[PDB]
PDB file of C-alpha atoms and ligand atoms in Angstrom:
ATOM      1  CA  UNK A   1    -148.594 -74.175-121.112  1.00  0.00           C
ATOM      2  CA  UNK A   2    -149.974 -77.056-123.318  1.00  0.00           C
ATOM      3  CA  UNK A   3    -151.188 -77.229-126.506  1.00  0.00           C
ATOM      4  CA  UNK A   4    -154.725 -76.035-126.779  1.00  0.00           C
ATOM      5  CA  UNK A   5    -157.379 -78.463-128.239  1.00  0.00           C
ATOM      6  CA  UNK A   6    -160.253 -77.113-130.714  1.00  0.00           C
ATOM      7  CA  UNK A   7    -162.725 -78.654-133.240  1.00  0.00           C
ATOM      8  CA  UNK A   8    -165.284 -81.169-132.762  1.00  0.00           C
ATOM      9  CA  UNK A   9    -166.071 -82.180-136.236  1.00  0.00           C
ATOM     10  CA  UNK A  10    -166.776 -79.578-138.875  1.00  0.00           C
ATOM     11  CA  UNK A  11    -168.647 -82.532-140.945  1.00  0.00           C
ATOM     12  CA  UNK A  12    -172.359 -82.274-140.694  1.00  0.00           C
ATOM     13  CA  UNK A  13    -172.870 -85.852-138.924  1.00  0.00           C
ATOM     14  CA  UNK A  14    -170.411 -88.977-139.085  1.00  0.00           C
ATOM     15  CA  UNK A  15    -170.420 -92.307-137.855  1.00  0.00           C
ATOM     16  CA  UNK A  16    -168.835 -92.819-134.385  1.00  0.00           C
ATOM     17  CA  UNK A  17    -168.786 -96.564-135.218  1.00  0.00           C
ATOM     18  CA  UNK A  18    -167.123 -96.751-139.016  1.00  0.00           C
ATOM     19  CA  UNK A  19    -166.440 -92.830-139.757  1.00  0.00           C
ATOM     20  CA  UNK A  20    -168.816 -92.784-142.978  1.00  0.00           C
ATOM     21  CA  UNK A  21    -170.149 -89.376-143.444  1.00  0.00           C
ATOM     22  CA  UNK A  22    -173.516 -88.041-144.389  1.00  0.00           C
ATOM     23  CA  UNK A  23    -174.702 -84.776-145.330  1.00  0.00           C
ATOM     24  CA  UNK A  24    -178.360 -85.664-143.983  1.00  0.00           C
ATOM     25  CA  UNK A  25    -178.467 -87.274-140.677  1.00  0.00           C
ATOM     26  CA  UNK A  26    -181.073 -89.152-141.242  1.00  0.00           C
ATOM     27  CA  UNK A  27    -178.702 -90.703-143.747  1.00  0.00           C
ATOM     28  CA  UNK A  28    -176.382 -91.737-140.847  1.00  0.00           C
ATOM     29  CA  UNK A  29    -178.852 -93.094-138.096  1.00  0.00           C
ATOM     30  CA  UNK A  30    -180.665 -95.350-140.186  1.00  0.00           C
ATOM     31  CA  UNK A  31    -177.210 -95.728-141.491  1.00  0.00           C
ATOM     32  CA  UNK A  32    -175.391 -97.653-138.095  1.00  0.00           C
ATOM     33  CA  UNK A  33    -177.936 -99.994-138.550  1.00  0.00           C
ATOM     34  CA  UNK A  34    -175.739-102.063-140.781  1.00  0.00           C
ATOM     35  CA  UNK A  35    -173.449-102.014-137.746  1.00  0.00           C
ATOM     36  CA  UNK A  36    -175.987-102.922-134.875  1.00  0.00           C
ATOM     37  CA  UNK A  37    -177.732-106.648-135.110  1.00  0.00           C
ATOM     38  CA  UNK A  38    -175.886-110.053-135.815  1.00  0.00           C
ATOM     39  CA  UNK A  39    -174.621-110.595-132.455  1.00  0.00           C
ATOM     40  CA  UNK A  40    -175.591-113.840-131.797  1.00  0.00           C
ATOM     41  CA  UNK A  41    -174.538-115.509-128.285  1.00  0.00           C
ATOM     42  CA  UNK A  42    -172.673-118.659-128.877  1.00  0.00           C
ATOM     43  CA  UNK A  43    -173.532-121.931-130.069  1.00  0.00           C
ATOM     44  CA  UNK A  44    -177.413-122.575-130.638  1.00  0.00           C
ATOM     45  CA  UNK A  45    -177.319-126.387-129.706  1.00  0.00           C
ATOM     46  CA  UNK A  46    -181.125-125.996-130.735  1.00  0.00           C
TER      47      UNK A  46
HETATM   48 ZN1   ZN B 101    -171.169 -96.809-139.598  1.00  0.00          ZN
END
């Protein structure tokens, strides 16, 4: 008595982070790169 969920994602790999899409995984891993780095931790004071 609820509606029934289905479907994961159809597209052959996306990214969790933006949502780009890429046929080739590969494509997407080194991909969420531009998302991972430059998180720096404050001010420097150095
Ligand atoms: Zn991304």
């Amino acid at each position: 008595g609820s509606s029934g969920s289905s479907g994961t994602g159809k597209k052959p790999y996306k990214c969790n982070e933006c949502g780009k899409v890429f046929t080739q995984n590969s494509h997407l891993a080194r991909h969420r790169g531009i998302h991972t780095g430059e998180k720096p931790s404050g001010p420097s004071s150095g």
